[PDB]
Design a protein around this ligand. Sequence first.
Ligand SMILES: [Cl-]
Ligand SMILES: [Cl-]
Length: 135
Amino acid sequence: MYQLHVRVVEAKELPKMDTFGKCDAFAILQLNSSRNIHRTKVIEKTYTPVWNEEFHIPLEDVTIDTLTVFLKDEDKGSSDDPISLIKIPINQFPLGEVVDKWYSLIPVKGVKKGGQIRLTIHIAPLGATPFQKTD
Ligand SMILES: [Cl-]
Ligand SMILES: [Cl-]
């Protein structure tokens, strides 16, 4: 009955993945290893993508669940090209609080920089208003 509200706000300091242009970045969110897998839109040709997209993900156990965030470059022939990732424990957010923070993405092998991503995260009972403190 707890919901993870995650606003994938923006990222910065992304790598130039190819000689032809800037990154076409999008983010994938996954709860644990479950089927709850969400994707943002692709922002074409920028190192500072701004998505400002909200996702509402039902949670299984707020003491152990993990959110994986995986930043990738849109498929241009070789599948989506991984940039970087982070695994965020759900238990580090006080229940009911709206937490707006930057996170350091770990670049995958062969990638020169991982980027930094801003997420606003709010875990609340599913009937509460998302992205407002649950007093
Ligand atoms: Cl182009
Ligand atoms: Cl939205």
